[PDB]
């Protein structure tokens, strides 16, 4: 019942794939997406933009990578996201923190099952 179907939480180092592949495909599929570089409010505090994205979206996609887990905004977003619903994507191999080590994720790195990645992602969002 939220304005956006999904918010995308990601590190700037992964922007190329996130914007040109993930957001591109989501929007083509009719999925309404909050993306910081378009939808953040300039002059709001970081925490305000985090909260706007989370509370106005049904779920938060978490784009896991080594750079995600070194990024302050990503961590703060994730912590609040755990109190709602998240869709973790393993985009690049990394050390996944203990509190995510028992959560099912969509594994982009597993090339042989890549043929079902988008099906699975879109199904969850639409469910």
């Amino acid at each position: 019942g939220k304005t956006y179907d999904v918010n995308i939480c990601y590190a700037p180092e992964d922007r190329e794939w996130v914007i040109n592949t993930l957001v591109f495909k989501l929007e083509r599929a009719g999925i309404k997406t909050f993306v910081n570089i378009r939808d953040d409010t300039p002059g709001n505090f970081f925490a305000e933009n985090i909260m706007d994205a989370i509370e106005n979206s049904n779920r938060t996609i978490v784009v896991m990578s080594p750079d995600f887990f070194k990024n302050n905004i990503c961590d703060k977003t994730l912590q609040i996201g755990l109190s709602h619903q998240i869709i973790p994507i393993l985009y690049r191999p990394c050390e996944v923190p203990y509190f995510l080590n028992h959560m099912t994720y969509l594994d982009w790195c597993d090339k042989d099952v890549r043929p079902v990645f988008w099906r699975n992602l879109f199904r969850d969002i639409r469910n």
Binding site: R59, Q85, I86, N127
Partner: peptide, 4 residues
Amino acid sequence: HHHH
């Protein structure tokens, strides 16, 4: 359907 909501997670969890």
